[PDB]
């Protein structure tokens, strides 16, 4: 298993706009196009995004193409990032794809405010930072897939997703 199969199970594929758990326009591979109430707002974003009038519907390739930027941008983030970086050279291989998960589905300053758990997961205090994690709007609202990520910084295995 790698990132992306990780990523892909997490947020599906959508050909069409569509409205994401928070309500906001998204497309493909969990791409959030924009946080603004119009779906034409969304179109034209979209269409900026692809580079041609897409009306609301993109191909699978598009899709994909997304996805592989959106996980660059998320890598190079985290490698930039004072606060993110440190942690994310602390851990093994499949710990790294957690963190990849949590920033894309936060961003980097989302992920940037757990202080705690950042702090505990580079000291390598693997149950204790699992419980403070579950302490968050994040783990609330998107439980199953929080749970997922946790499983993952919890065991440092793909079980959480060898079910899926």
């Not at 941008?73 to 790294?96: E, Q, T």
Request: aromatic fraction near 8%.
């Amino acid at each position: 298993m790698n990132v992306f199969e990780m990523l892909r199970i997490d947020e599906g594929l959508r050909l069409k706009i569509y409205k994401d758990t928070e309500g906001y326009y998204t497309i493909g591979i969990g791409h959030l196009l924009t946080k603004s109430p119009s779906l034409n707002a969304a179109k034209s974003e979209l269409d900026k995004a692809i580079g041609r009038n897409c009306n609301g519907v993109i191909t699978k390739d598009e899709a994909e193409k997304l996805f592989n930027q959106d996980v660059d941008a998320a890598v190079r983030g985290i490698l930039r990032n004072a606060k993110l970086k440190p942690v994310y050279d602390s851990l093994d291989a499949v710990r790294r794809c957690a963190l990849i998960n949590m920033v894309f589905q936060m961003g980097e300053t989302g992920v940037a405010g757990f202080t705690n758990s950042l702090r505990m997961l580079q000291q390598k205090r693997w149950d204790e930072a699992a419980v403070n994690l579950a302490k968050s709007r994040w783990y609330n609202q998107t439980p199953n897939r929080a749970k997922r990520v946790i499983t993952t910084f919890r065991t440092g295995t793909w079980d959480a997703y060898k079910n899926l």
